[PDB]
Design an enzyme around this catalytic site. Structure first.
Site, PDB file in Angstrom:
ATOM      1  N   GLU A 172       0.869  -1.203   0.000  1.00  0.00           N
ATOM      2  CA  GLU A 172       0.000   0.000   0.000  1.00  0.00           C
ATOM      3  C   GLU A 172       0.892   1.235   0.000  1.00  0.00           C
ATOM      4  O   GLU A 172       0.565   2.213  -0.721  1.00  0.00           O
ATOM      5  CB  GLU A 172      -0.923  -0.020   1.195  1.00  0.00           C
ATOM      6  CG  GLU A 172      -2.050  -1.041   1.127  1.00  0.00           C
ATOM      7  CD  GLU A 172      -3.136  -0.759   0.096  1.00  0.00           C
ATOM      8  OE1 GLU A 172      -3.035   0.302  -0.544  1.00  0.00           O
ATOM      9  OE2 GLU A 172      -3.993  -1.649  -0.155  1.00  0.00           O
ATOM     10  N   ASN A 188      -7.680   8.903  -5.550  1.00  0.00           N
ATOM     11  CA  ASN A 188      -8.529   7.894  -6.222  1.00  0.00           C
ATOM     12  C   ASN A 188      -9.275   8.577  -7.377  1.00  0.00           C
ATOM     13  O   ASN A 188      -9.275   9.825  -7.474  1.00  0.00           O
ATOM     14  CB  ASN A 188      -9.462   7.248  -5.198  1.00  0.00           C
ATOM     15  CG  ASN A 188      -8.706   6.568  -4.071  1.00  0.00           C
ATOM     16  OD1 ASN A 188      -9.001   6.759  -2.891  1.00  0.00           O
ATOM     17  ND2 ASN A 188      -7.709   5.782  -4.439  1.00  0.00           N
ATOM     18  N   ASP A 246     -12.515   8.561  -7.776  1.00  0.00           N
ATOM     19  CA  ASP A 246     -13.778   9.156  -7.297  1.00  0.00           C
ATOM     20  C   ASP A 246     -13.503  10.504  -6.614  1.00  0.00           C
ATOM     21  O   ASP A 246     -14.492  11.054  -6.118  1.00  0.00           O
ATOM     22  CB  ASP A 246     -14.500   8.141  -6.411  1.00  0.00           C
ATOM     23  CG  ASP A 246     -13.841   7.892  -5.058  1.00  0.00           C
ATOM     24  OD1 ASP A 246     -12.688   8.337  -4.874  1.00  0.00           O
ATOM     25  OD2 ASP A 246     -14.503   7.298  -4.186  1.00  0.00           O
ATOM     26  N   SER A 290     -11.725  10.856  -3.799  1.00  0.00           N
ATOM     27  CA  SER A 290     -11.200  10.532  -2.447  1.00  0.00           C
ATOM     28  C   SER A 290      -9.679  10.365  -2.519  1.00  0.00           C
ATOM     29  O   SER A 290      -9.106  10.256  -3.605  1.00  0.00           O
ATOM     30  CB  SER A 290     -11.835   9.313  -1.873  1.00  0.00           C
ATOM     31  OG  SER A 290     -11.469   8.179  -2.579  1.00  0.00           O
ATOM     32  N   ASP A 295      -6.295   8.292  -0.452  1.00  0.00           N
ATOM     33  CA  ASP A 295      -5.809   7.259   0.507  1.00  0.00           C
ATOM     34  C   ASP A 295      -4.623   7.826   1.277  1.00  0.00           C
ATOM     35  O   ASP A 295      -3.714   8.431   0.642  1.00  0.00           O
ATOM     36  CB  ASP A 295      -5.357   6.017  -0.233  1.00  0.00           C
ATOM     37  CG  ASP A 295      -6.429   5.289  -0.999  1.00  0.00           C
ATOM     38  OD1 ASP A 295      -7.599   5.366  -0.575  1.00  0.00           O
ATOM     39  OD2 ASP A 295      -6.058   4.614  -1.992  1.00  0.00           O
ATOM     40  N   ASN A 307      -8.873   5.367   3.223  1.00  0.00           N
ATOM     41  CA  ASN A 307      -9.538   6.227   2.229  1.00  0.00           C
ATOM     42  C   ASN A 307     -10.488   7.227   2.895  1.00  0.00           C
ATOM     43  O   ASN A 307     -11.214   6.870   3.826  1.00  0.00           O
ATOM     44  CB  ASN A 307     -10.218   5.314   1.235  1.00  0.00           C
ATOM     45  CG  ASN A 307     -10.886   6.087   0.130  1.00  0.00           C
ATOM     46  OD1 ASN A 307     -12.068   6.422   0.163  1.00  0.00           O
ATOM     47  ND2 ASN A 307     -10.094   6.402  -0.867  1.00  0.00           N
ATOM     48  N   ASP A 319     -15.297  -4.594   9.428  1.00  0.00           N
ATOM     49  CA  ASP A 319     -16.346  -4.723   8.397  1.00  0.00           C
ATOM     50  C   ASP A 319     -16.366  -6.168   7.884  1.00  0.00           C
ATOM     51  O   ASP A 319     -15.292  -6.863   7.881  1.00  0.00           O
ATOM     52  CB  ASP A 319     -16.132  -3.731   7.276  1.00  0.00           C
ATOM     53  CG  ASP A 319     -17.163  -3.885   6.202  1.00  0.00           C
ATOM     54  OD1 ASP A 319     -18.380  -3.806   6.557  1.00  0.00           O
ATOM     55  OD2 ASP A 319     -16.780  -4.209   5.089  1.00  0.00           O
TER      56      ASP A 319
END
Ligand code: NA
Length: 129
Positions: free
Chosen positions: A35, A46, A48, A50, A52, A59, A101
């Site tokens: 990462e 990103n 969209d 956003s 990271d 994110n 999650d």
């Protein structure tokens, strides 16, 4: 801060990531390598809009506030800049909420594509842990 591999392994273990939600420590070290290259100051935008942030590339859509991700959430209740500190506490606390999650470590695309199904314990070998 650019961590050494064993340095990061020891910090992640101290903060309780070893076997957190059943993911052994080498999974977390492998994820951080692919990462961020073990660099807490890593950021990546990103598609969209956003971003990271930090050693686990957390994110801004869901997890932190960066003030430039419209209609996003802040479920870790932190400024995204907290995730770039040399102190990995905020990144670990937030990674614990992410991995809790139902998607588990599949939230981390680099983990899924370069760590999952591999001998991840290689990432902690040689370390005094
Ligand atoms: Na956000």
């Amino acid at each position: 801060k650019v961590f050494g591999r064993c340095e990061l392994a020891a910090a992640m273990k101290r903060h309780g990531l070893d076997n957190y939600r059943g993911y052994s420590l080498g999974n977390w070290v492998c994820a951080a390598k692919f990462e961020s290259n073990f660099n807490t100051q890593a950021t990546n935008r990103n598609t969209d809009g956003s971003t990271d942030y930090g050693i686990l590339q957390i994110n801004s859509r869901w997890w932190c506030n960066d003030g430039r991700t419209p209609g996003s959430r802040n479920l870790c209740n932190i400024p995204c800049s907290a995730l770039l500190s040399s102190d990995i506490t905020a990144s670990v606390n937030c990674a614990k909420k992410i991995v809790s999650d139902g998607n588990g470590m599949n939230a981390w695309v680099a983990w899924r594509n370069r760590c999952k199904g591999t001998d991840v314990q290689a990432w902690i070998r040689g370390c005094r842990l």
